[PDB]
Amino acid sequence: TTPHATGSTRQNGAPAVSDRQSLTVGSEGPIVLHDTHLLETHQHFNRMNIPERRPHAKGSGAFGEFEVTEDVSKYTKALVFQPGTKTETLLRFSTVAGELGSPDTWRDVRGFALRFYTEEGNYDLVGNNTPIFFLRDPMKFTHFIRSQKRLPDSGLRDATMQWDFWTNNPESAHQVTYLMGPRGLPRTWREMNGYGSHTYLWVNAQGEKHWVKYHFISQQGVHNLSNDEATKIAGENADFHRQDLFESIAKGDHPKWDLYIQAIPYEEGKTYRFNPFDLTKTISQKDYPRIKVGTLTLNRNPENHFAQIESAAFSPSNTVPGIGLSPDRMLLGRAFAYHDAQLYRVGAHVNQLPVNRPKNAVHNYAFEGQMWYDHTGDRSTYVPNSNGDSWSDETGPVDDGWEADGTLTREAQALRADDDDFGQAGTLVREVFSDQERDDFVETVAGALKGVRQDVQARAFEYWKNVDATIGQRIEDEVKRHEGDGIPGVEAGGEARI
Amino acid sequence: TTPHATGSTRQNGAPAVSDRQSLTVGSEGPIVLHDTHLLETHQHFNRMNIPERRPHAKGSGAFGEFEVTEDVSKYTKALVFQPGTKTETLLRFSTVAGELGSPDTWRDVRGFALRFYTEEGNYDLVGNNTPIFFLRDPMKFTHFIRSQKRLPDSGLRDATMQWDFWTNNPESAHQVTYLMGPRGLPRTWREMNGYGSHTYLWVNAQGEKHWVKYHFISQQGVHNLSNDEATKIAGENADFHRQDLFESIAKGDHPKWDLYIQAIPYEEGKTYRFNPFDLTKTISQKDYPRIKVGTLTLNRNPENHFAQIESAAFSPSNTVPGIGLSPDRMLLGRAFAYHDAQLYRVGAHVNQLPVNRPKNAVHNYAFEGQMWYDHTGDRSTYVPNSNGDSWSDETGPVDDGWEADGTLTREAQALRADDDDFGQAGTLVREVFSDQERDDFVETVAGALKGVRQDVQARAFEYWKNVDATIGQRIEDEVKRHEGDGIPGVEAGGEARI
Amino acid sequence: TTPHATGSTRQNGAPAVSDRQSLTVGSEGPIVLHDTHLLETHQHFNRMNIPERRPHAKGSGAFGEFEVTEDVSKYTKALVFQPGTKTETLLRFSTVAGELGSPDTWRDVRGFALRFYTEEGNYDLVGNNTPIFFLRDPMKFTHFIRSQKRLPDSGLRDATMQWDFWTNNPESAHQVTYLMGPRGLPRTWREMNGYGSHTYLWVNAQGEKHWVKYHFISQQGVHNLSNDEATKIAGENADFHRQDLFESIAKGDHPKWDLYIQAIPYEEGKTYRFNPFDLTKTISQKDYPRIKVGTLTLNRNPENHFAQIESAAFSPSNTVPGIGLSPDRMLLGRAFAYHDAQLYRVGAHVNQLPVNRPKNAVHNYAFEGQMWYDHTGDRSTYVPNSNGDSWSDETGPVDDGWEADGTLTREAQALRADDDDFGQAGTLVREVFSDQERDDFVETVAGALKGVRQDVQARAFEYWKNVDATIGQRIEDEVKRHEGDGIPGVEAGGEARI
Amino acid sequence: TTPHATGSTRQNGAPAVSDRQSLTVGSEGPIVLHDTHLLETHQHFNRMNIPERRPHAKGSGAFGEFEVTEDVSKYTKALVFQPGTKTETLLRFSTVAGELGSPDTWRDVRGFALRFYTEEGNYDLVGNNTPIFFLRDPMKFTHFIRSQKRLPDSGLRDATMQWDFWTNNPESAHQVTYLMGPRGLPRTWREMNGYGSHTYLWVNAQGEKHWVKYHFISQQGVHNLSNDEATKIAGENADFHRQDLFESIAKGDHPKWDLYIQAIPYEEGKTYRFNPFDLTKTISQKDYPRIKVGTLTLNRNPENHFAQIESAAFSPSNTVPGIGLSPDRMLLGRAFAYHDAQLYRVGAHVNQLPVNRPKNAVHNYAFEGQMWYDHTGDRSTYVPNSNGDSWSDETGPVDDGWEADGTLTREAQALRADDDDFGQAGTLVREVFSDQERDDFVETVAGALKGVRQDVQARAFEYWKNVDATIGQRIEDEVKRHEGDGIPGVEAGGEARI
Ligand code: HEM
Structure with missing residues (x-):
């Protein structure tokens, strides 16, 4: 590439000399502090990982x-x-x-x-x-x-x-x-x-x-x-x-x-x-x-x-x-x-x-910060301004809103005529699933409950009976027999769990 | 706990009011910006994860x-x-x-x-x-x-x-x-x-x-x-x-x-x-x-x-x-x-x-920085000082060092009489392993090579023959039959791999 | 302190040996990479500064x-x-x-x-x-x-x-x-x-x-x-x-x-x-x-x-x-x-x-994160739980709220009988300030406007006349004479400003 | 710009609607959590500042x-x-x-x-x-x-x-x-x-x-x-x-x-x-x-x-x-x-x-990390590789090095024939400075020592006499008279200093 090229560069574009051996005092001596290629490559390696998403990491x-x-x-x-x-x-x-x-x-x-x-x-x-x-x-x-x-x-x-x-x-x-x-x-x-x-x-x-x-x-x-x-x-x-x-x-x-x-x-x-x-x-x-x-x-x-x-x-x-x-x-x-x-x-x-990045032009009032790749030049940083740098100022009701009225509260949403916690679940179990899907569902839920602490199991039997009386009793029966599928990704019981 | 306690606090120690419902304009209205408990708990949730170790994450x-x-x-x-x-x-x-x-x-x-x-x-x-x-x-x-x-x-x-x-x-x-x-x-x-x-x-x-x-x-x-x-x-x-x-x-x-x-x-x-x-x-x-x-x-x-x-x-x-x-x-x-x-x-x-933290007292010349829990009070920030804040100044050869002599170089270490890349590996295969361990080793290495691109396989046959002629030929024979164990954690081949 | 103490420690509590000389190959040789005290102290030095507050840095x-x-x-x-x-x-x-x-x-x-x-x-x-x-x-x-x-x-x-x-x-x-x-x-x-x-x-x-x-x-x-x-x-x-x-x-x-x-x-x-x-x-x-x-x-x-x-x-x-x-x-x-x-x-x-930190006990649903000094042990991470780890769940109107009703909008607040932008400013200038304070105010505002681009000056004269007709004309007169105080911290004009 | 443009955008390129009013429940109501333009602009504002350089911030x-x-x-x-x-x-x-x-x-x-x-x-x-x-x-x-x-x-x-x-x-x-x-x-x-x-x-x-x-x-x-x-x-x-x-x-x-x-x-x-x-x-x-x-x-x-x-x-x-x-x-x-x-x-x-960024092409073995703008596509992440992605491997002495020999030590550099701490300073004072520069130097150093704790002043008189006997006595005389220039940026003395 360049007259003094070696096959790769450091971060500044200069030839790196070696991606395979560190800079030492003779073959047998210590690595020197000023092996800047070793430093740059290891410091970057040490900063490759970023926090995984929470949730949805994988x-x-x-x-x-x-x-x-x-x-x-x-x-x-x-x-x-x-x-x-x-x-x-x-x-x-x-x-x-x-x-x-x-x-x-x-x-x-x-x-x-x-x-x-x-x-x-x-x-x-x-x-x-x-x-x-x-x-x-x-x-x-x-x-x-x-x-x-x-x-x-x-x-x-x-x-x-x-x-x-x-x-x-x-x-x-x-x-x-x-x-x-x-x-x-x-x-x-x-x-x-x-x-x-x-x-x-x-x-x-x-x-x-x-x-x-x-x-x-x-x-x-x-x-x-x-x-x-x-x-x-x-x-x-x-x-x-x-x-x-x-x-x-x-x-x-x-x-x-x-x-x-x-x-x-x-x-x-x-x-x-x-x-x-x-x-x-x-x-x-x-x-x-x-x-x-x-x-x-x-x-x-x-x-x-x-x-x-x-x-x-x-x-x-x-x-x-x-x-x-x-x-x-x-x-x-x-x-x-x-x-x-x-x-x-x-x-x-x-x-x-x-x-x-969007496909269309961004014209946003945000400036500076770490790692600012695409800067705004001498654009005004404030609005209104007398320098021809546009801004938004639509007043009144927005086009994509709605109404509200009440006192500040922390409470459940009001129930509509047919709202509850269990009825749509029950339709799914009773009306949507096939017989084979119901059979597999019992094996899945019973397996998911295997080894669960008994107080929690008892609450789960009530939960499932509220979904559907029949499915809930089938689940309870199977849990009481200590049967059910292994569930990929999770289990219960033993000295390292509740 | 406190006269106005609710069962939990915000980060400032004040009662949190609810860990279960957000602050809305009536039951049906939007969440307000000033639900500070929702904000604190979600902003912390969003900062729970830290970069995993590289390597040795798990x-x-x-x-x-x-x-x-x-x-x-x-x-x-x-x-x-x-x-x-x-x-x-x-x-x-x-x-x-x-x-x-x-x-x-x-x-x-x-x-x-x-x-x-x-x-x-x-x-x-x-x-x-x-x-x-x-x-x-x-x-x-x-x-x-x-x-x-x-x-x-x-x-x-x-x-x-x-x-x-x-x-x-x-x-x-x-x-x-x-x-x-x-x-x-x-x-x-x-x-x-x-x-x-x-x-x-x-x-x-x-x-x-x-x-x-x-x-x-x-x-x-x-x-x-x-x-x-x-x-x-x-x-x-x-x-x-x-x-x-x-x-x-x-x-x-x-x-x-x-x-x-x-x-x-x-x-x-x-x-x-x-x-x-x-x-x-x-x-x-x-x-x-x-x-x-x-x-x-x-x-x-x-x-x-x-x-x-x-x-x-x-x-x-x-x-x-x-x-x-x-x-x-x-x-x-x-x-x-x-x-x-x-x-x-x-x-x-x-x-x-x-x-x-060590068990013994730390007296280290480092100050300030984010998240400084245990500060140094008014201790001197420099050495020597005239304020009685001690420092280290041992001069001459350290007690835990050694000698070196040479020109700055990037090269392999010099070989001792018995140094090479393959001989100790060969002792492990020939002299340390049992017959059953050798049999399992062939199945493991052959499996590890299954689906590997053929140029790389050919180099691997030479590598293993350099370790040991017999083991290398056994591995090559098994790879050429398309046999060997599945290796937990990795495979080769297909349109998503080399 | 300890049998092998030197006057200061590294971050692990071990004696640091020297706060004054780096680890070199002989007196004349290079610094070695493994001068861990040099590394720790410089890496901390390089991380002492934190972003200053925005605003209110000083x-x-x-x-x-x-x-x-x-x-x-x-x-x-x-x-x-x-x-x-x-x-x-x-x-x-x-x-x-x-x-x-x-x-x-x-x-x-x-x-x-x-x-x-x-x-x-x-x-x-x-x-x-x-x-x-x-x-x-x-x-x-x-x-x-x-x-x-x-x-x-x-x-x-x-x-x-x-x-x-x-x-x-x-x-x-x-x-x-x-x-x-x-x-x-x-x-x-x-x-x-x-x-x-x-x-x-x-x-x-x-x-x-x-x-x-x-x-x-x-x-x-x-x-x-x-x-x-x-x-x-x-x-x-x-x-x-x-x-x-x-x-x-x-x-x-x-x-x-x-x-x-x-x-x-x-x-x-x-x-x-x-x-x-x-x-x-x-x-x-x-x-x-x-x-x-x-x-x-x-x-x-x-x-x-x-x-x-x-x-x-x-x-x-x-x-x-x-x-x-x-x-x-x-x-x-x-x-x-x-x-x-x-x-x-x-x-x-x-x-x-x-x-x-508050003086009272914190019992907050936030866990993990970088630099977690005071951890929560085996406390439950979710609510409700069956393990005796309390939470808050007050329902209904909060004690420190108020009412609202309307459509989602972006608009100025409605004016009360006596609300405007200039009247309270005018009371301050006319009724609160003394004559000497008014004289100094004219010198201050006129100075603050010295060198300001003329379109902006013209708008400022109108702004100040809206506050008070008399003060506004006094300011305008002084600005047109190119007189007024230097204002500590800011000026206008020249080829590096608007 | 776009059919529904308002004068500015959010970070995703969509019209921002207003840079001047927040999204509220009616004119008099609270700000809603989902004012995403308010959130984006304030969260960016809060992240504009970066650590200043240490040293050389200004x-x-x-x-x-x-x-x-x-x-x-x-x-x-x-x-x-x-x-x-x-x-x-x-x-x-x-x-x-x-x-x-x-x-x-x-x-x-x-x-x-x-x-x-x-x-x-x-x-x-x-x-x-x-x-x-x-x-x-x-x-x-x-x-x-x-x-x-x-x-x-x-x-x-x-x-x-x-x-x-x-x-x-x-x-x-x-x-x-x-x-x-x-x-x-x-x-x-x-x-x-x-x-x-x-x-x-x-x-x-x-x-x-x-x-x-x-x-x-x-x-x-x-x-x-x-x-x-x-x-x-x-x-x-x-x-x-x-x-x-x-x-x-x-x-x-x-x-x-x-x-x-x-x-x-x-x-x-x-x-x-x-x-x-x-x-x-x-x-x-x-x-x-x-x-x-x-x-x-x-x-x-x-x-x-x-x-x-x-x-x-x-x-x-x-x-x-x-x-x-x-x-x-x-x-x-x-x-x-x-x-x-x-x-x-x-x-x-x-x-x-x-x-x-350099002007020439970068070909560096560093990948991933936060804020990776210019990625390396499917380039190999390791060397040597069989995929044609070049690397460096020059062996032996580098072109820009030197020799060293000794034991690992922490000590002062050996003195050359004319090395000391004071002689070049003394040449600067005696031979390089003019008479007027020497006069101003005395006023500067004496001012810099005004209010300094007396033990430190006494050491400073010895330091300056070691530079030059005459200048050192002139400085000492002036300090003992409590005279000297104010030094822009620093002073000594009082209950908030040593
Ligand atoms: C061993 C001694 C020194 C160390 C460890 C050191 C370290 C540093 C560090 C960490 C910074 C901030 C870099 C950044 O955040 O971008 C800095 C900046 C700076 N230093 Fe040094 N420094 C030393 C000696 C010197 C010397 C002797 C010179 C000049 C010959 C010098 C000139 C500068 C300059 C000009 C800057 C500012 C660079 C810029 O404008 O961004 N430093 N130094």
Whole structure:
């Protein structure tokens, strides 16, 4: 390359001389302090690792395209969803509880984090493989995730801790049912569905509002593993899902999902018999049918997993005109939490990394900070200014809001006509599952309760009977026989657990 | 507790009001920005995770005691090793390559990181479960560990990458042989040996020097798993070793190790037929027999894994009077690398956390920094000073050094009479292993090579024949039949690997 | 100390050998990499500095006591303010705009950050030396502080930037008037008043609410410097105020302030003719007289400025039972902003440092994180739990809240009968100032406008005439003559400014 | 810009709606948690500040060009210094002790940090405005800089602390003399000289070595301020030097310096009568005359001070082929210290920021880490590899080294024939200074000693008499009369100092 090149450089671009031997006083002498290549390479090595995500540490993803094939402009003005629009995407899939090195095939929720690189900013639909969640207020989320992780003394996951939390938070029943059913163990990420879970707001060009749910239905179908199959794979190939996705795309097999929405008129949000602002509820498709939007295709692997996947930073706060948040307390907490975490995990300038940069021009009032790659030159740092550096100042009601009235309180959401903690779980068990899925569900839940401390087991029997009397008694009977499946990723009992 | 108590507090000690519901405008309204308990708890949640160690992320440990039962005062003045001395200890065990959530029973080196809380400072013997390592110069260490981790695009571990590195760094053969043998898969941490690996310096009260090796021989014996058993356990119980140690201690079964040293007179370090400063070499016990020192017992579990184990920060730089480093280049690099990493991983004041604090008084010229818990009051910040705040100023040759002479160079260490890359590996295969261990070794190495890119396989056949002609041909034959064990933690081949 | 002691230790407690010479190969040879004392001391030196506060970087403080001498229990149940109560305090004083090394005697607001170490938590009254501020919505605060700091290209403070911001944000007029008056240059921190500025909520034992203002009236009186005196001191003694406070306390002269409150009945908050929730307004003492509470005395210097002052972390979120926030948007933003900044500035565990620790027991649901000094042992990490580890779950309206009703909006606060941007500023100029203070005010404002770009000057003449026609014309006349005082800390004009 | 644009964006590129009002429940209601623009802008504001440099916090700079106008190829092969070569440069000037906001015109050393963006990497000559320094071993540097900063309790600079350190470290006398002379107060950065201070190694194309000193002689001459003038300016314009440089360049007045070297043959380094490896010594120009190299011109201001100046990261480790370090212990410590500090101050990827990026291609074995902007794709992470990703492996003696022989020691450097602590200082006072400069020097040193604790004063009288008997007695006489200049930036005495 250069006249004095050696095959590699230091960080300043000068030849490095050797990537294989340190600088010593003769062959037998000590290493000198001024081996600057040894220092730079080791100091960087020592700073490669970054905090893993909490939750959703273990995951991978791919790039692709979304194509709108229907007309939903009467519901939203968002550029990404206008007729015919094609938009580049990034999708990261993940588990929830396990850490960076944990097996892909533990029983768990899966993440479905989808970025659209739109012409009006990065739009992130940060979803999961379920339409609901375990909780309806974000104050509980910290407790839930800690209960899914490790005991403070022994450092082991513990089903007693998990069930102690779930049984004492009965709002969890709908999603625990989903988790313990077939879909707790996707065969591949290509063979699971994605969902927004929350109600979001869509706003059309005239300002009319609808409450919407997102459903990404896999064109590869929904295919799952048994507990025993998933345990075997966890030992044989801890990266089975990561490998599957990369190999599939490398061979030219590009997985697809069709996006559908449900759309509730603004005024009906307040009156519907299930609370659309309660993340533990689904909305009936008889009442609000699915409406097709378009198709997502994944077609391109990362070239650098760490820079393009590990360093990606998704957030529900990354809305675009035509799409807003909703009165769902969980979503409102998420609006804060992701960006906050990313400032620590990645850095203040996380959104300047290529994968997080929008396609359109950023004109944002933020300056300085560590690792400021793309600076603002001599632009004004304040507003209004007399130097022609524009700012925003729209006054009055926003286009993507709603109304509220009351005293400051900490209390449960008011119940709609058909709201409770157990009924939708019961519909899932009784009406949605097949007989074989119910049989497997009993083996799963009974196994998940094996070795759990008996006080917690007794509460779990009541919890499951509240879901469904028959399933609850079947579970109790099997637990009392000390039978049930091993659950990949967690157990109970012994001197190192509760 | 207090007149207005609610059951828990915020970070300022005031009652928190609720750990279960956020502060909203009426039951149905949005969360307010000034829910300071929601903010504090989520912002802390978002900062719980710290960078995992690189390497040795996955591990656990226990506290105990070392008791000296022999007299080695003619070799060292170190307080911890004087006759009859009992000293509190902490031992962290670990794998090497896998991340925080990876299975305990992957094939790998194990760490054996032992702190002695001595009356003259914390003395750390940061060992492994092998007396040797893969490399003899720290410039190569970064490359080696990266080769043991993941491919840059797909994020998969890859045996092709591992073997490409090993075959191109034939100094690795002694330790690769040990790793691929029985001891690559300890049954429990209680049933493996520990070693310092490096030569260290011991200095007696009169200033005489000896070069020493440390050997911690388990009183529970050395017991290992087959590849197939370890794979099965990796799926069924990713924390098998962590659980075993905690349960053992909880039941009152306290594991023990007997410490022995080898002691080489100072002048013989330069002349010995194997280089004692080459980390790829063992020293013959016929030439330098083992000398008993005393016994290590583990007897107490952590009460908080994260604060006492994850936040522990060991370093070979933590020598005490009577114990020094040596001309081993690897050890000299380690003297820098651990403390450096810990400043990033934990923080500038890592050594003020309780687990890292010495028992004796610290009087160190370091002030200020983030998270400064134990400040120095009005003590002088400079030396010499006229205010009675003491300092050190010993001049001339140190008590724990050695000589050097030469020009600044980057080159391999000079060979002693019997030094090479393959001979000690060959003794291990031919003379130490049993017939059954050799049979299993062939199945292990052949399995480890299954699916590896053929150029790299061909280099590996030559590497193994250089270790031993017979074993190398047996391995080659089996690889050419496409037979061999699955290796827990890594594979080769397919569209997502080299 | 120890048998092998040398006068100081390394971080592990072992003797350091020398604080004065590095470890070299002979007297003439290179420094070796394994000079671990050189490495530890330099790596700590390189991590001593922490981000300075933004704003309020330049400051110092002292400890003391608050004594309640009146009965205000009909207004608040807070333990700190019950009859006869004595509470330890910490007070940090500061400027606003200048950085860590800037002169104490620049013209500026001064901070008055007061912690009470109460028996129900740390209560922080984070005040200033003025009862008002420049702004009424926190979205503008970032812009304001940046406008008070440096131009993006040249790195100079610039009065053109300052006035461009102020004139385009006429809500600033009340506080700009106060700043440009006598009190912009306190002689000492002992000779200025402190104020909460915001309306806070006080809640009594029966739950009745009052809106309150805090006033700390110096027993040393209010004494100020001229611009010329303060400029001279800025050159001669950049730490004049820091030195004054430390010397005063060292000699036994303990400064005092008497605390008074104004108390507005809950329902009158909504109806009062000035908006008590607008930080740009004072509340008439004819309408709501001052009510004495007690006396603050400072009596003890820090022993370590960095650990006790620089590392102190105050926050308006640190309320205690009996004291809450208010509908003032600025205060609601502050509830978030301080703790957030401190996580970056100091660390996640900022509130475990001794100066930030409460006196009462903390029982908070936060675990792990870097630099975790005081761990929670095996306490449950989730709620509810079946292990006897308590939590909070009060449901329904909080005791320290209020009501709201409307659509989500971004707009100015509604005007009360007597609200505007200029009238209270005009009362200050016309009715409060003396003739000599008005003369000096003209010289100050005219000087502050010298060299300012003419478009901005023209807007400033209109701004000042809106405050008071007479003062505005006097200022304009003097600016058009190119006369006025030099203002310590800032100027305008030349090729490096707007 | 976009169909729904508002004048500015959030960090994701979506319209921000307002930079001036927060999102509230009606005009009178609270701010909602999901005001994501308020959150992003405040969280960034709270992370703008970065640790200031230690030392050399206060500074500024400009870009320019170096032009070689002579032929020094017989001494170096470095591309930047070959005949006729023109290279872009960046120069940052600074004080040493004061913090980010301190006045530019305090008495102090000035930095002269010069980067050349060469075709073989960034070459940094990190100099000062003096050819010598206070110390000859880096172990003392931490102590020295702390002694130049603030007392641990009161937070004041203290001349007693400064002189306690200097008098107890008599190696300081040469540079203290220079500092206390005329050049302690440059009028502008344009009117001071720059120096490398250390001996560096130059290596020619044939491998022959010379020891070199760098001298940058200002074409604007050397012009200084009196103590009284500099004190006055410190109050009136704390940024006088920063402003001067920016204004000069903005008007088209481009300051210049001529670079000269001294060149000592390799073998004469060992024998010269002053130790060229002792940073407290100059080398006689009668013995080794200055040899012209070329001319530096500054011609371009930053467009963004923070990104281009504050975030610049210079290091003596940034050598290029043809230029190496030397046996000077101070320089060898600097090889480690700068890069280390920058990892904390700026970040692991500091050298990827535009100002720190080389012009030539970087091919460095470092991957991952926070804020990784320019990733390496699928490049191999290890060496040797079988994938065509090059590395370095030069073996044997380096081209830019030297010899050493001895035992590991901590001791002073051996004295050459003419080495001592006081003689060169004495030549400066007696032979270099004029009568008026000597008169001013007495007033400066006597002023610097005013109020210093008497034990330290007595040691200072002996120190100055050792420099020169006459000057020392003149200083003592004046100190005993309680006369001398005020010294800008520091004083002694009173209850807040020693
Ligand atoms: C062993 C002694 C020394 C050590 C350990 C040392 C260390 C440091 C460190 C850590 C910094 C801050 C770097 C950063 O954060 O970017 C610094 C800055 C600086 N030092 Fe040194 N220093 C020493 C001696 C010297 C000498 C002798 C000179 C000149 C010949 C010098 C000139 C400078 C300059 C000019 C800067 C500021 C660079 C800039 O403008 O960014 N230092 N020093």
